[PDB]
Amino acid sequence: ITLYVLVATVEALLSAGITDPYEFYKYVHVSEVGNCSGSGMGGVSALRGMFKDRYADKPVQNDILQESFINTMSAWVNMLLLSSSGPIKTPVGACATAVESVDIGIETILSGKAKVVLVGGYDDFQEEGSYEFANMNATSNSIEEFKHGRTPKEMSRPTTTTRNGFMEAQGSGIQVIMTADLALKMGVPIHAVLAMTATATDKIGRSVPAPGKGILTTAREHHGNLKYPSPLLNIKYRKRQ
């Protein structure tokens, strides 16, 4: 997973046009380049080493727990590419890790603690996670899908009548986010503007994997008395103010 993260990180910097990661330090202090990316589970292969291969007395590296930590991938990114002293904040959303990471990165940038942040999320597929997800019946049953005549390239079918669990995958995804003024001063390609980002919980429950409508609060507004438009939504009023 750390290999996937390193590749995705260099490719994200190259998408941002930064061939040399130290080019940030021409424009921002070393304390203003951070890495707020994360993982749902982290180094599951290192956890397998620790919990299974060491129990079996197989030859396992002595620093396997280091590779098992979820912030180790960010640590390796900083140790091999960035060498920044900016904020490092490793989220764990377990499935929303990347969007939560974008949230953390944006608040980090807007608080002034960083000017560049490496956000994103990564995860790896392994025997043990696959078996556990099967036990929780979260993933589709391949035997049942073959019985239904479904090929692997058509087993993952969101929104259909016959959706029966998700298709577990592996990999990483990284984005380089920064202030608009920094992007324009550096002359980097501004691919998008992150206008909004939010995280939320649902309610009382006794089912962790049960999804909920907690993120509906992103659309919250008051509607008791709308007899007149709010002036603040009007662009020219804010412009004269």
């Binding site: 509607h223 008791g224 008395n225």
Partner: peptide, 7 residues
Amino acid sequence: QSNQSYV
């Protein structure tokens, strides 16, 4: 969405 909770 109360009529008295905003003003």
